[PDB]
Amino acid sequence: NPTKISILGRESIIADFGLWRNYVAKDLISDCSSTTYVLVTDTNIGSIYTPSFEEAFRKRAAEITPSPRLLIYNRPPGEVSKSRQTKADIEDWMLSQNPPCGRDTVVIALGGGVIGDLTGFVASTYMRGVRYVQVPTTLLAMVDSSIGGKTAIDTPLGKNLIGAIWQPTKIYIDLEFLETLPVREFINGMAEVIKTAAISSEEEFTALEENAETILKAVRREVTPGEHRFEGTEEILKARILASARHKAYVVSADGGLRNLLNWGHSIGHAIEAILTPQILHGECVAIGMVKEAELARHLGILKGVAVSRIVKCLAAYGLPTSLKDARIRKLTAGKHCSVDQLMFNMALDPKKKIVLLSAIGTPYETRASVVANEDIRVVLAP
């Protein structure tokens, strides 16, 4: 049975296994009644899941009268698609439709944090805003990128510079997408997952700690014909993940302050990110950022050394990097390292920086980011 989570006090998230093949299509033409449905995704994810829906759709589609339409759009993969250019193409394609897609349109963003942010924004402006729904296919996008309504596109001058806040009418979470998801991508998203637990529930973090081996194996497992990747670990998985989504959903319904706690490990993660990108992923930087930011709390006497080692353990126990000198990261970027001045500078692109400090695993020092001295920061970065 699907689990329903609420955002901004309203039905929104519906999670379970395989909602894609048998749920979305019907649930759409039911709740999101419309005559036109524009699906957007990238060739990568598309080619793997597009066919299934065209079937699921036509199915539930023709069942009703008149039958609505499904127009599909495939954009190139990569961060390069979140651009003023494609957005317009998308729009233009839509207006070009016969008949042109109208305000009654219901857009479906099927993808990771990229297709999400892009399609969300597209909807947010098409004829001053039209309905849309999230169908994250990335772990991260499932527990973050798709919850909150934050949408945007990049500019050669920066990322997420142009966009808007546009809440999706529905956020379908089909855990099966994680079957085909690249292992590195899974492990990437896990960072957020952990982040979540670390600032909300001690019990949750602990469970994570236990399930690691279990979950990790599955992802790395060899799927025998006829099978489904997570057969047997469904609840352990579904639980741990929704745990995060649930939290993000909660904090979004509240915040400005509380919502700042979602930036744990990010304060430093982003400074690292700026340098190690794009060879290194987000969650990868955030993972290290978390460790570093964790070490910082202890340094200020807030966090117990015990917990610092516990966070490091959990991260690495899931395949996440824990130091800037991580051997795997090295071979991935020959000729690149993060000076302390570069880090501290990158952080300034946001005398005293604001940071989420943990009092203990599950309990943040405050209900928001605290102000730390540039000097104290400089010591956790110091070799």
Added chain:
Amino acid sequence: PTKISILGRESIIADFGLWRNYVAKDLISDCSSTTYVLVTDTNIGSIYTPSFEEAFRKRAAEITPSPRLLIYNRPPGEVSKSRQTKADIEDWMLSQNPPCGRDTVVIALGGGVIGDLTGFVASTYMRGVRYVQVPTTLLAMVDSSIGGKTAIDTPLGKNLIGAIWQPTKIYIDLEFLETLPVREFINGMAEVIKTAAISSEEEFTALEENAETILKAVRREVTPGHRFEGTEEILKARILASARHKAYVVSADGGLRNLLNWGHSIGHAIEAILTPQILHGECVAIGMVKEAELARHLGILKGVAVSRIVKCLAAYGLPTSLKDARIRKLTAGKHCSVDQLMFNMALDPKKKIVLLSAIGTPYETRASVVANEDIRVVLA
């Protein structure tokens, strides 16, 4: 300075000359910020930009730290409401030293074009930043700037891409009407009349009696040294009457708000054909007459009122037939067929229209459903 409230919160502040002495101060006061981006077109700009730089620097330096005023001048015309211009303004704002931040407060100084464009720009810059309306067109003062509707055009259509973004303040300096082109004034008057026609019988009447007065002040060639000296109240009244209403219907939130489309149902079909030689209010004026004639045809509206509406429109310089010579000269060769108009009304399959029961009293609290056949008579 009179203040009208929209969406249960004062945001419209009207009076004469707020520009030269009010906005600048009121901004750094209520819209506290460190960066103020002004956008306008060369036409309107060159005429009023200098004054503000003074008014700003003034009230600006009178505080510490002192905020900045960055100005942007775009070409005049409907051509500026484009994926393009907007993109250039966003880049421009990002290319700044320092880059324009989220604390930015944008000022849209212009007519329905600069308004819709700048409004949208703000609506997306870093997911949305504050902004305020400073309409310089009669129409924009009583419509285009009230409601938060913003957008840009696409070679595939107008207002196809945009968003709803409420301005934090809507300054209405009636003086802008001094320099406003006469044809432009008369253009905006259409809405003004539309307003009264669907809300207050008394208001429409005042409009009538005031025709000669207001029109003269307009057509009149003002010697050096103002334009409406002596007619300020008559004018300020009539105009705010409209704004007031639009503010009300917008704040009353799918009903009462469809009534703002009176004369438009047909006005737009005409518009599509006679544009761009013919203006909006010009088409709407004719559209009103036609839609007025339609109500009477269905037995709703009194023939008396029809003529009354026709009279008022023309008494203000507005066109009243697709045969108006003034029109056909600028439209030599472009005639609107009964099907062509019916076809253009389709682009908005059954046909809904605001019907008047009487001047000041609409038939219903929204647009009614009329037979394509009954419509086919009003046209040609």
